[PDB]
Amino acid sequence: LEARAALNQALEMKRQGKREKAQKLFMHALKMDPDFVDALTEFGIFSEEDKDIIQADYLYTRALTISPYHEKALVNRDRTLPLVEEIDQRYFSIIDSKVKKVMSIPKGNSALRRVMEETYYHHIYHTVAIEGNTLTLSEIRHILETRYAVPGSSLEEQNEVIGMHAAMKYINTTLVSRIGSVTISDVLEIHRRVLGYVDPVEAGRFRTTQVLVGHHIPPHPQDVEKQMQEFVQWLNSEEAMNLHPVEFAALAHYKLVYIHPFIDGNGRTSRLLMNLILMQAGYPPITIRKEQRSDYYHVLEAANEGDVRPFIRFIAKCTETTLDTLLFATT
Amino acid sequence: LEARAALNQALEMKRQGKREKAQKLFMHALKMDPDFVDALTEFGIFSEEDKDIIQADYLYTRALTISPYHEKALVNRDRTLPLVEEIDQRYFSIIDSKVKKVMSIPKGNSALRRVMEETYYHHIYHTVAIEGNTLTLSEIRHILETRYAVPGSSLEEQNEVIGMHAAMKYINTTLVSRIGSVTISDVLEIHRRVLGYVDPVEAGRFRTTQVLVGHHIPPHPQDVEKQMQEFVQWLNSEEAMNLHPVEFAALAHYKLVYIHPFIDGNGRTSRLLMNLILMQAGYPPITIRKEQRSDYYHVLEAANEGDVRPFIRFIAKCTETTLDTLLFATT
Ligand SMILES: [Mg+2]
Ligand SMILES: [Mg+2]
């Protein structure tokens, strides 16, 4: 048991007062056994000493999903759960007050006008770049302003960009202002534009083949439609409307990605649905940056393994970064 | 009546023995009055002297569609109608025997192999060039071989080309060899690929707005579906199967263009349907050349004004040119 060995080194290393070695030893131990209950528990206690309550609670919560009767994780989780709820609520309150300031700024303001036009091309850049698109911000600007092809670049990559433009224009023209319930048709019409210029056969229609997505196996094609019916019901439900808008938008994003209803364009379509929910709640649209790709996939994995909270927190931080930029620009 | 004046000059000019002036004077007169019964009749008699029986009969036939009791057109038409039927049949027999020779040539032949690969890119070039696409044969070859964009050319123009490639590949993979009836779905699946990369919203769905096409007003959108049902019924009918394949393929082309079922891609889709019918009858695919555009539109106009025979003859000549090239190349 190299797992059981690595932990005892980590605990010894902590006792001595070497945080950095202990840190790595805890990580090494959980790489060797990701379901190692005592390693999660002891790394949690360690994290609380650095004042990282959220991480400690994530670890205790994970431990219990494996061994729900582990006494040391249970006693600790019972303390941290209500505490982390309060910390998470307090962060939503900081976001709420930062949105109030941004909502207040006069609509004509020359600074706010400049920022919003840049973030349009910026959103297209990052949302395609995240899927492996190699086009630059300026190349994307050239494609959308002139409608002419960029030299020595794949037509497919350029068609992903005009697809994103057509989808966002459709959302802003037809959906953002529309009052009433979201429909499966709304999602199909978004996808039709996202993927239409790349794969017109598959655009606007459900995946017909089972796939692997990282370590995720999504619903079988035969179940995709019913899962999407249950999803849009949730989008229109009472409990969804009573969530904080950032949590509602984050969970809508995660649920759609989990279902993976299309052969491709699931990520791009989910990030558009997120921004529709946020904008309908009077939030600004947010952009998960190309550089955040690895963090993005890590919090999706944590959600798949049973805890969606790090994903929600990740979307909350993206939402705060977006607001900070707008406030800064108009201050 | 400048019409009545121009004719009398033409007749006088013919009496004297000046064919060229008379020719132009007859044309000038029919420009001024396209329904001028005596001008059509007298130009017909003139055409018979040059041994142009087909033109003379076209003119007599046109005269009678205006004035069905004009005695001089009627006596002439009654003579030329059965004669032109025989001449048209004899041309179909020359085409039939030229197809027999081409069908015979060994399938492995290195010369036949070379020709057919060139005509693929050649077909895409002419079918898009006819619709106003400014891309060159080599630019089209670069787009389809590399999938990379050509410098300083519109994405739309390049997407028309990958659409044509996807449609032709689909036809050859799924339709050409398939046995049984053609369906409306087959036509929608062709259109889905033809227009999918340019207009994914409209690809594979019937026109929802009334349009003008030259001087042609097609069926109103509310009638498009029923007209397409009647059209595919005709495609699968007994009378269609008993037509000469060239006449069947030409009339299928004309009927679909007349209905104009889509917002765009009607021409490209009709030329594909023509080549599917020809190839299923063991004919080679044909290409209406960019340079023939004006002749093409002239015979479509003659069909709209009540005589489809010049259109059928035009497709027959295109079919003979195609065969002559193949025979030449392998001789
Ligand atoms: Mg590049
Ligand atoms: Mg050019």
Side-chain angles (χ1 to χ4, degrees), chain A residues 2-20 22-27 29-30 32-106 108-109 111 115-240 242-329 331, chain B residues 2-20 22-27 29-30 32-106 108-109 111 115-240 242-329 331:
Chain A
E2 189 187 329
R4 279 52 177 170
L7 169 51
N8 284 307
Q9 312 212 242
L11 288 173
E12 174 50 40
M13 223 58 53
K14 188 191 91 173
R15 170 207 148 254
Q16 288 188 359
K18 175 45 168 293
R19 307 291 295 171
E20 289 73 12
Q23 231 284 347
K24 270 145 166 166
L25 286 160
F26 282 119
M27 300 289 270
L30 287 161
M32 300 301 128
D33 189 14
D35 296 18
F36 187 14
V37 169
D38 297 334
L40 294 166
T41 303
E42 284 294 332
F43 192 31
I45 294 166
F46 175 90
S47 298
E48 290 205 67
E49 296 165 350
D50 296 325
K51 302 196 200 182
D52 199 344
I53 310 310
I54 278 166
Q55 183 173 103
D57 173 83
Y58 167 75
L59 291 168
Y60 303 144
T61 304
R62 203 195 191 205
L64 288 172
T65 55
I66 305 149
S67 179
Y69 287 95
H70 191 65
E71 200 174 28
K72 200 180 215 188
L74 192 53
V75 68
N76 279 306
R77 166 59 161 168
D78 288 334
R79 180 177 48 81
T80 62
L81 168 52
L83 173 55
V84 168
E85 283 199 29
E86 176 64 22
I87 294 161
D88 290 338
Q89 274 193 354
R90 283 187 186 193
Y91 188 50
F92 279 161
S93 282
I94 288 174
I95 287 162
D96 284 349
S97 73
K98 281 193 184 186
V99 173
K100 192 153 189 162
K101 290 202 287 290
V102 165
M103 282 209 220
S104 302
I105 278 167
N109 183 226
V115 173
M116 287 308 204
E117 295 163 31
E118 285 164 33
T119 60
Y120 190 93
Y121 295 124
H122 183 266
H123 180 78
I124 296 177
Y125 170 63
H126 287 289
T127 204
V128 301
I130 271 196
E131 296 303 326
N133 195 302
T134 66
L135 289 171
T136 72
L137 178 49
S138 39
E139 285 172 337
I140 285 165
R141 187 179 313 105
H142 178 77
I143 289 162
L144 290 177
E145 282 175 3
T146 71
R147 305 295 186 185
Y148 272 51
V150 159
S153 301
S154 98
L155 278 171
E156 188 187 336
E157 281 195 336
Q158 317 201 35
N159 283 331
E160 287 181 356
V161 167
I162 72 171
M164 284 307 314
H165 177 70
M168 288 164 71
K169 189 177 199 185
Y170 173 76
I171 289 173
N172 291 336
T173 295
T174 306
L175 299 185
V176 68
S177 304
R178 200 191 68 193
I179 188 65
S181 46
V182 62
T183 66
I184 284 187
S185 293
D186 294 332
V187 176
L188 296 179
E189 291 297 345
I190 292 165
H191 190 256
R192 215 166 281 280
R193 291 166 176 73
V194 169
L195 203 73
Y197 302 87
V198 171
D199 191 341
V201 175
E202 291 293 325
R205 96 169 173 202
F206 294 138
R207 179 164 56 78
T208 55
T209 59
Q210 186 56 292
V211 291
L212 178 66
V213 188
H215 285 277
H216 180 54
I217 300 169
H220 191 278
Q222 293 189 134
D223 304 310
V224 160
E225 184 172 28
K226 173 159 185 198
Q227 294 260 288
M228 286 299 289
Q229 288 169 346
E230 290 173 348
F231 170 60
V232 299
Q233 191 172 320
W234 175 84
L235 285 179
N236 294 302
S237 78
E238 216 59 57
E239 61 159 343
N242 296 337
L243 295 168
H244 190 283
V246 169
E247 181 163 357
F248 174 36
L251 283 182
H253 180 159
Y254 173 67
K255 288 178 189 286
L256 186 53
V257 161
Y258 180 92
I259 291 167
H260 198 86
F262 309 116
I263 198 56
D264 203 357
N266 294 286
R268 281 163 280 164
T269 300
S270 293
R271 289 188 291 278
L272 286 178
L273 177 56
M274 185 174 64
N275 279 348
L276 174 60
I277 292 172
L278 286 173
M279 284 172 74
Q280 280 185 350
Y283 285 69
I286 74 171
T287 294
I288 302 163
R289 285 176 276 96
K290 166 185 192 153
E291 303 73 22
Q292 298 184 272
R293 173 178 210 288
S294 173
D295 293 340
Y296 178 46
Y297 275 98
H298 204 247
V299 289
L300 285 172
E301 285 198 348
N304 294 344
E305 286 178 12
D307 191 359
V308 302
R309 292 178 297 161
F311 186 77
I312 295 167
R313 291 193 200 101
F314 171 86
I315 299 304
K317 299 190 209 89
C318 289
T319 303
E320 183 185 36
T321 304
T322 296
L323 290 163
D324 290 341
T325 298
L326 286 162
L327 286 172
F328 187 100
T331 305
Chain B
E2 189 187 329
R4 279 52 177 170
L7 169 51
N8 284 307
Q9 312 212 242
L11 288 173
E12 174 50 40
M13 223 58 53
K14 188 191 91 173
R15 170 207 148 254
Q16 288 188 359
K18 175 45 168 293
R19 307 291 295 171
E20 289 73 12
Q23 231 284 347
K24 270 145 166 166
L25 286 160
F26 282 119
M27 300 289 270
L30 287 161
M32 300 301 128
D33 189 14
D35 296 18
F36 187 14
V37 169
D38 297 334
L40 294 166
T41 303
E42 284 294 332
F43 192 31
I45 294 166
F46 175 90
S47 298
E48 290 205 67
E49 296 165 350
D50 296 325
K51 302 196 200 182
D52 199 344
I53 310 310
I54 278 166
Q55 183 173 103
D57 173 83
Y58 167 75
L59 291 168
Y60 303 144
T61 304
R62 203 195 191 205
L64 288 172
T65 55
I66 305 149
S67 179
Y69 287 95
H70 191 65
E71 200 174 28
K72 200 180 215 188
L74 192 53
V75 68
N76 279 306
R77 166 59 161 168
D78 288 334
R79 180 177 48 81
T80 62
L81 168 52
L83 173 55
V84 168
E85 283 199 29
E86 176 64 22
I87 294 161
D88 290 338
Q89 274 193 354
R90 283 187 186 193
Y91 188 50
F92 279 161
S93 282
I94 288 174
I95 287 162
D96 284 349
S97 73
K98 281 193 184 186
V99 173
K100 192 153 189 162
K101 290 202 287 290
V102 165
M103 282 209 220
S104 302
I105 278 167
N109 183 226
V115 173
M116 287 308 204
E117 295 163 31
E118 285 164 33
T119 60
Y120 190 93
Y121 295 124
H122 183 266
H123 180 78
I124 296 177
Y125 170 63
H126 287 289
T127 204
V128 301
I130 271 196
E131 296 303 326
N133 195 302
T134 66
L135 289 171
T136 72
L137 178 49
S138 39
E139 285 172 337
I140 285 165
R141 187 179 313 105
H142 178 77
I143 289 162
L144 290 177
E145 282 175 3
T146 71
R147 305 295 186 185
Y148 272 51
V150 159
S153 301
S154 98
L155 278 171
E156 188 187 336
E157 281 195 336
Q158 317 201 35
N159 283 331
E160 287 181 356
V161 167
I162 72 171
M164 284 307 314
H165 177 70
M168 288 164 71
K169 189 177 199 185
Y170 173 76
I171 289 173
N172 291 336
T173 295
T174 306
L175 299 185
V176 68
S177 304
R178 200 191 68 193
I179 188 65
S181 46
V182 62
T183 66
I184 284 187
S185 293
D186 294 332
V187 176
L188 296 179
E189 291 297 345
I190 292 165
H191 190 256
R192 215 166 281 280
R193 291 166 176 73
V194 169
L195 203 73
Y197 302 87
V198 171
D199 191 341
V201 175
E202 291 293 325
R205 96 169 173 202
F206 294 138
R207 179 164 56 78
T208 55
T209 59
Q210 186 56 292
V211 291
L212 178 66
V213 188
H215 285 277
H216 180 54
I217 300 169
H220 191 278
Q222 293 189 134
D223 304 310
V224 160
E225 184 172 28
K226 173 159 185 198
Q227 294 260 288
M228 286 299 289
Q229 288 169 346
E230 290 173 348
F231 170 60
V232 299
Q233 191 172 320
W234 175 84
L235 285 179
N236 294 302
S237 78
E238 216 59 57
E239 61 159 343
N242 296 337
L243 295 168
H244 190 283
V246 169
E247 181 163 357
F248 174 36
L251 283 182
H253 180 159
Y254 173 67
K255 288 178 189 286
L256 186 53
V257 161
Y258 180 92
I259 291 167
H260 198 86
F262 309 116
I263 198 56
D264 203 357
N266 294 286
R268 281 163 280 164
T269 300
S270 293
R271 289 188 291 278
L272 286 178
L273 177 56
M274 185 174 64
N275 279 348
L276 174 60
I277 292 172
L278 286 173
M279 284 172 74
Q280 280 185 350
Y283 285 69
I286 74 171
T287 294
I288 302 163
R289 285 176 276 96
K290 166 185 192 153
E291 303 73 22
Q292 298 184 272
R293 173 178 210 288
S294 173
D295 293 340
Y296 178 46
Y297 275 98
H298 204 247
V299 289
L300 285 172
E301 285 198 348
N304 294 344
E305 286 178 12
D307 191 359
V308 302
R309 292 178 297 161
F311 186 77
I312 295 167
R313 291 193 200 101
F314 171 86
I315 299 304
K317 299 190 209 89
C318 289
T319 303
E320 183 185 36
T321 304
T322 296
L323 290 163
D324 290 341
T325 298
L326 286 162
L327 286 172
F328 187 100
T331 305

